[PDB]
Amino acid sequence: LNDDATFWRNARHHLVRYGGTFEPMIIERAKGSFVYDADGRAILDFTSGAMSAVLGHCHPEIVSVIGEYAGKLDHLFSEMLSRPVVDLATRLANITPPGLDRALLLSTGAESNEAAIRMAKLVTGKYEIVGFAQSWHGMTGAAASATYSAGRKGVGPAAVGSFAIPAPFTYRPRFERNGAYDYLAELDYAFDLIDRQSSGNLAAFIAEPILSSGGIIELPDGYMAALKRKCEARGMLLILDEAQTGVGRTGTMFACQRDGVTPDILTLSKTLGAGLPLAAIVTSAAIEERAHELGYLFYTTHVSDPLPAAVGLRVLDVVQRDGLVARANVMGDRLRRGLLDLMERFDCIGDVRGRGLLLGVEIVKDRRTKEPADGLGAKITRECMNLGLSMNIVQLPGMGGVFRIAPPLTVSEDEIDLGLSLLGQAIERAL
Ligand SMILES: *Cc1c(COP(=O)(O)O)cnc(C)c1O
Ligand SMILES: [K+]
Ligand code: NA
């Protein structure tokens, strides 16, 4: 049973608490879209772990390549090159939009955004970084200073030159222009204010194609392009953080491709490692060449490490030959319709949004006032677990509890259905 007393005692005596609250179970194993506790209960992983496992848990391809390299090429001096590294770097150059040519293979999302930010500040000679009011880029220094969804208090000053403009949020609009929500005018409004505060050292703007932590907020039509132009006008770089949107989760290999707006630097992680610690940034040959002249430096233990690079190249291998980016739209629409049907049966569901296999459901006390559903959200999530469905709900002020649904890009038609079924039941029990 999950009640192992020795387990929870050790877990209580020797575990540092880092946010949230631990699941009252002991996950024994995982396969495909399921994790299993000590009793063997199958739990549908509707969050792909930490929004990472795009090929599902313990996927055969990955299990073999990892072992393959674990025993062949593992770790190397950070100045030695290998085929897995040059191949992944080259692949990424090829699957990312034209303009993105060079890659740096790292380990974490925060670490990758750090890399992009350091390179931007260097190349631009400036140091001010602008992000979204409800963004999330990591727990480390710069990634954390550009993160406004959570973690800014009780830990001292943020990084110097940290600004944030509101994120365009169509469901909860607050910027009107002609009786309509003008999120583009809201962009200009925001940046003017930015300019007024800027010390004249704006280096770049980090942005998530779809703000995940911030409640799955997809940037409206024309925003990305507009944003991109705002940055060019000020000689700023546009850093697109696709840690969760990258690698076909939204139905395109890269969300930035949807808008057709390629950034100056692109950072990848979560979905790129498919569960392992592999991350990377990709930039133009112009910026890289320049950053090089300025002596750019981002020397880590695991940068250009054989094993991770190999798994990453494999994750891209299968995602491609198995057209999971498409599986993402196919299964994403199945999940979406189902959610709309449930939204159709329950009033607490005020909104269903997102793209591809990164959907979001907002629980509200009532459509009319769109008043956040207090506790209900937590309850439904609680109920889902009992029913054997692993869900995740994020809660920010002035916004209802948002369920972040993101199963593997490998989910089956039935697995999707199973999920819908359990969610519907959970909502019935929560009310
Ligand atoms: C998850 C997340 C990260 C943080 O990456 P870590 O691997 O936890 O350091 C970075 N960017 C975005 C958009 C994320 O959602
Ligand atoms: K190394
Ligand atoms: Na490219």
Same structural domain for residues 239 and 329? no
In angstroms, the CA 70 to CA 261 distance is: 38
Pocket mutation for ligand 1, best pick of 139, 211, 270, 392 (most atoms within 8 Å of C-beta): 270
Residue 182 counted as domain residue? yes
Q: If you take atom 6 of ligand 1, which residue's CA is the nearest one?
A: 109
Same structural domain for residues 309 and 338? no
Q: If you take atom 12 of ligand 1, which residue's CA is the nearest one?
A: 137
In angstroms, the CA 133 to CA 289 distance is: 32
Residue 239 counted as domain residue? yes
Same structural domain for residues 184 and 106? yes
User: Active-site positions?
Assistant: 136, 208, 241, 244, 270, 404
Last residue of a domain, one of 322, 342, 364: 322
Same structural domain for residues 363 and 224? no
User: From residue 188, how far is each of 195, 210, 263 by CA, in Å?
Assistant: 10, 20, 19
Residue 21 counted as domain residue? no
Same structural domain for residues 134 and 172? yes
Range of the domain at 142: 59-322
Residue 357 counted as domain residue? yes
In angstroms, the CA 146 to CA 92 distance is: 25
Give the ligand at the shortest distance from the Cα of 108. Answer: 1
| Contact (Cβ atoms closer than 8 angstroms) between residue 165 and residue 178 | no
Same structural domain for residues 279 and 337? no
Same structural domain for residues 203 and 69? yes
Residues with CB under 6 A from ligand 1: 108-110, 113, 136-138, 208, 212-213, 241, 243-244, 269-270
What is the distance in A from the centroid of ligand 1 to the CA of 90? Answer: 23
Angle between helices 60-70 and 306-321 (to 10 degrees): 160
What is the distance in A from the centroid of ligand 2 to the CA of 147? Answer: 28
Q: Give the CATH number of the domain where residue 332 resides.
A: 3.90.1150.10
Residue 17 counted as domain residue? no
| Nearby residues of 303 by Cβ (< 8 Å), 6 or more positions away | 78, 104, 105, 106, 107
Method by which this entry was solved: X-ray
Residue 146 counted as domain residue? yes
Residue 16 counted as domain residue? no
In angstroms, the CA 240 to CA 255 distance is: 9
Last residue of a domain, one of 322, 340, 365: 322
Last residue of a domain, one of 268, 287, 322: 322
∠360-361-367 over CA atoms, to 5°? 140
Same structural domain for residues 212 and 71? yes
In angstroms, the CA 59 to CA 53 distance is: 9
Give the ligand at the shortest distance from the Cα of 78. Answer: 2
Q: Give the CATH number of the domain where residue 299 resides.
A: 3.40.640.10
What is the distance in A from the centroid of ligand 1 to the CA of 211? Answer: 11
What is the distance in A from the centroid of ligand 1 to the CA of 428? Answer: 33
| Contact (Cβ atoms closer than 8 angstroms) between residue 273 and residue 308 | yes
Same structural domain for residues 43 and 163? no
**Residue 292, both tokens:** 């090089």
Neighbours of ion ligand 2 (CB under 5 A): 78, 305
In angstroms, the CA 356 to CA 168 distance is: 19
**Residue 348, both tokens:** 């607490």
Give the ligand at the shortest distance from the Cα of 308. Answer: 2
Phi-psi region of 398 (alpha: psi -120 to 50; beta: other; left: phi over 0): left
Same structural domain for residues 311 and 330? no
Residue 155 counted as domain residue? yes
| Nearby residues of 32 by Cβ (< 8 Å), 6 or more positions away | 56, 57, 59, 408, 410, 415
Same structural domain for residues 130 and 149? yes
Same structural domain for residues 342 and 237? no
Provide the domain count of the chain.
Answer: 2
What is the distance in A from the centroid of ligand 2 to the CA of 299? Answer: 9
